Design a protein around this ligand. Sequence first.
Ligand SMILES: Nc1ccc(S(=O)(=O)N(CCNCCN(Cc2ccccc2)S(=O)(=O)c2ccc(N)cc2)Cc2ccccc2)cc1
Ligand SMILES: [Cl-]
Ligand SMILES: [Cl-]
Lengths: 99, 99
Amino acid sequence: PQITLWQRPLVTIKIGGQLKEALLDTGADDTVLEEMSLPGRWKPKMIGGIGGFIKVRQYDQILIEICGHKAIGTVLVGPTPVNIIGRNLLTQIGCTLNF
Amino acid sequence: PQITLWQRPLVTIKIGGQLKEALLDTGADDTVLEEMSLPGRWKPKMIGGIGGFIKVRQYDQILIEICGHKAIGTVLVGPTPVNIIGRNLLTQIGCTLNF
Ligand SMILES: Nc1ccc(S(=O)(=O)N(CCNCCN(Cc2ccccc2)S(=O)(=O)c2ccc(N)cc2)Cc2ccccc2)cc1
Ligand SMILES: [Cl-]
Ligand SMILES: [Cl-]
């Protein structure tokens, strides 16, 4: 698809069998999702936002679909204003910026 | 151009006679740059997300050039950890997300 930016690039993702809205964020190195239950073990991760660094939970090798495109990768969980898809999964699905 | 997302999508901008480096950020509504002088009137604004909010100065109708493309728009100025180009200017250069 081609997505313009006149509105927020919000899309439907699927994770854990659930559909959710998420923001495609080229500014984000990593994917950060609102608190949810995920399987397996998690590790600690410090991420830097505009208002400073915060602690989130890192789950690896998780299945997630983005606009129907299937991915398996790292997902962080913590207090984000909205689910964000960052470059780790944007690259997997073959996303680029174009002008 | 077609900008990969393997790396942070950083470009050179020119603003207020200054040349700066800035992150193309589809997740940001508006452009925010580290402390600098800009001409004209401004109004205070709070922006935030991860790790908090910061106070910024909002300048409207500012001329900027991004990769040779000239655009006009709102520029927020404040203690952002990294210079960010937001959707409000990404649209003007015809930037889209593609996959
Ligand atoms: N006008 C304007 C208003 C707000 C913002 S923002 O606060 O940057 N923002 C846009 C998301 N940018 C992602 C990068 N992040 C930090 C940043 C800050 C400054 C420079 C580079 C990197 S981040 O903190 O959001 C982040 C950090 C790490 C990961 N993995 C994901 C997101 C708000 C938002 C956060 C999350 C969800 C929805 C919305 C920018 C401009
Ligand atoms: Cl911890
Ligand atoms: Cl990953």
